[PDB]
Structure 1
């Protein structure tokens, strides 16, 4: 992380657009009011290996919603995990229990850096499908669909549910309907990384469209669910893993196998996050409060994207920045070149990674004008 150089930078006017976590308009970490009001347990005894049971139940219901048949019929195997990262790893380690010939996983051509190592450790080579279009800083749907169609039948296909990291480029629900048809027809196994449900657009149901739509279409769906961003619980390491199966008996056999993976890795998961999420989701008042706060976070991110674009136009930039508003979530592929990123750092002390990814959570009312002028100056 570029944090060290930013911190060491003596310049009076500097901006860190490399951060990985939410910040409010005052550039402060943001502890949710619903999290402050959550009730903790009183016992520090170990949780069960598969997690606090009420937490896992609420995580399932939040992921799949109130009218999910799979959930009703008990055919989903689930557990608490060490954030979304733990779910990706434990899920990856579980895949050979139900996927034949399981040595490859397909992910978007521009994707989340840690995915490669996670799945390598689990015995699978991450291989790309067409996804990001650098000319438009947007989606290459035709390319995605063709790659999925040509992949061997029974391939594992990694997809981001929403707020694609690092580009911010998300397919529409129309686009996802086409994607899921290919996944079903080719008998592929979807592995959904859902790290930003509710955080992405402020709408929990909309943001969970991809796992909810797939769970009825395929024999097995995997979902890695993170509570880091949407509850602001990052460092407490709170997530869940879900695998759908044909029957409650199949799900039970997979939960036993989950336990055999968890116990010799970390024995059992940390209490704090699970207490907080379970407390909030079982309380109507706290749940309502949480939903209001989700919208506050998602609206601020959306509005600062919109403000960046409008300020760029006000500065006199003649280039097109509409991708910044089309993209969703904290991470934006700006389209700035390596040279331009290097100039923003040297000349303006604005820090972002060399791929032109900007963490827009670092943008706010007090610096968006400065950053816009800088981006105009290095691109004009």
Structure 2
């Protein structure tokens, strides 16, 4: 928030904000999807049910798990609408801490999403790290991850990013996830999937939901926190869903009613607007096909600008390796710049990143990529 306010107050004409949390188009503008503009809104403003607009919840389920999913056919998954991904993470955590014995710890990647620590602390669970990011390669440390998961106490809650890891952009492959998931099954761990970027990551909805789809048949309980903030661009409308797989329809009904008991004394019932939009889009074959193509356009721009930054760096004469910038996936990139280097980019060039070298690559575009590349070279050469 401080980097935002400083950027805003900075008088320089050439300034660039690479600390934002939101997608931007090539003209650095906010981007309301056409499928969203074309969506049909509700006719009244009556409160939705505590657990959300039923049609929205059902489409969220199908989008997450696929329309063929056995768990979903059998009614084994307990679901509700939530205040973005954040609300799902919180409600999920509050549910675990009430109902899992000695659920006072949750394991997440060593470099991870800032709000997770406080979300789970409010739920009475201490975020503990497992090995994940390798700063030498700005890449993955699988062996370290597998080992930490294998040695975590049986029945540990394991938090994983489904794709487009935030803030590094470092994702395991599907092959890697197969190994990770086997360890989770064998150690009877409870996987908690934060899926904030389905489809936004690679432009492929199915591929991007591999983690929860693969885990759902492997473990007794899978938790998924699903955000529609980025992939429908619905940020400030606060729209997401929480999913918890269970053994049976009857068990799922009992969990939903326990979800209601957490939701009611928090905010009573959830905001309509985002639920309308997502429900309307996913039930309309024209809006759904448009949405899919818009997702690909967002995801392709991000991957193309990453690839452009790398090629511009080479054209500027950089002799350092930037291949991590193209291997990483999604909106957030751990650049591998040092604190000193980040500070000089700010001071001399008015390019704003976090001090850990995270760059929101959505803030790069046709208009500024060349300049940012030159500056990055100048400060690393």
Pair in the same fold by TM > 0.5: yes
- Post-superposition offset of 1:97: 4.9
Q: Is the 8 A contact 2:194 2:224 kept in 1?
A: yes
SS in 2 for 1:275: helix
Find the aligned partners of 1:83 and 1:348 in 2 and give their Cα distance.
35
Q: Is the 8 A contact 2:310 2:322 kept in 1?
A: yes
SS in 1 for 2:48: coil
Find the aligned partners of 1:345 and 1:82 in 2 and give their Cα distance.
34
SS in 2 for 1:93: helix
Q: Is the 8 A contact 2:174 2:210 kept in 1?
A: yes
Per-residue deviation, residues 348-367 of structure 1 (Å, max 9, x unmatched): 00000000000000000000
- Post-superposition offset of 1:342: 0.3
- Post-superposition offset of 1:207: 0.2
- Which consecutive aligned stretches of 4+ in structure 1 deviate over 3 angstroms post-superposition? none
Instruction: Report what 2:270 is aligned to.
Output: 269
Instruction: Report what 2:248 is aligned to.
Output: 247
SS in 1 for 2:295: helix
Q: Is the 8 A contact 2:157 2:191 kept in 1?
A: yes
Find the aligned partners of 1:172 and 1:227 in 2 and give their Cα distance.
23
Per-residue deviation, residues 161-184 of structure 1 (Å, max 9, x unmatched): 000000000000000000000000
Give structure 1 stretches of 5+ with no counterpart: none
Give structure 2 stretches of 5+ with no counterpart: none
1:12 and 1:366, CA in 2 relative to 1: closer, same or farther beyond 3 A? same
Find the aligned partners of 1:340 and 1:198 in 2 and give their Cα distance.
33
Q: Is the 8 A contact 2:26 2:366 kept in 1?
A: yes
- Post-superposition offset of 1:117: 0.2
Per-residue deviation, residues 239-291 of structure 1 (Å, max 9, x unmatched): 00000000111111100000000000000000000000000000000000000
Per-residue deviation, residues 49-83 of structure 1 (Å, max 9, x unmatched): 00000000000000000221000000000000000
Find the aligned partners of 1:69 and 1:261 in 2 and give their Cα distance.
28
- Post-superposition offset of 1:99: 2.6
Per-residue deviation, residues 14-64 of structure 1 (Å, max 9, x unmatched): 100000000000000000000000000011000000000000000000000
Q: What is the Cα-based RMSD across aligned positions, in Å?
A: 0.6
- Post-superposition offset of 1:98: 4.4
Instruction: Report what 1:358 is aligned to.
Output: 359
Find the aligned partners of 1:164 and 1:100 in 2 and give their Cα distance.
29
Per-residue deviation, residues 319-372 of structure 1 (Å, max 9, x unmatched): 000000000000000000000000000000000000000000000000000000
SS in 1 for 2:81: strand
SS in 1 for 2:191: strand
- Post-superposition offset of 1:96: 3.3
SS in 2 for 1:2: helix
Q: Is the 8 A contact 2:97 2:124 kept in 1?
A: no
Q: Is the 8 A contact 2:18 2:352 kept in 1?
A: yes
Instruction: Report what 1:193 is aligned to.
Output: 194
- Post-superposition offset of 1:12: 1.4
Instruction: Report what 2:282 is aligned to.
Output: 281
- Post-superposition offset of 1:301: 0.1
Find the aligned partners of 2:99 and 2:302 in 1 and give their Cα distance.
39
Find the aligned partners of 1:356 and 1:11 in 2 and give their Cα distance.
22
Find the aligned partners of 1:62 and 1:247 in 2 and give their Cα distance.
21
Per-residue deviation, residues 80-129 of structure 1 (Å, max 9, x unmatched): 00000000000000113543321100000000000000000001000000
Find the aligned partners of 1:39 and 1:256 in 2 and give their Cα distance.
29
Q: Is the 8 A contact 2:185 2:218 kept in 1?
A: yes
Q: How many aligned positions are there?
A: 380
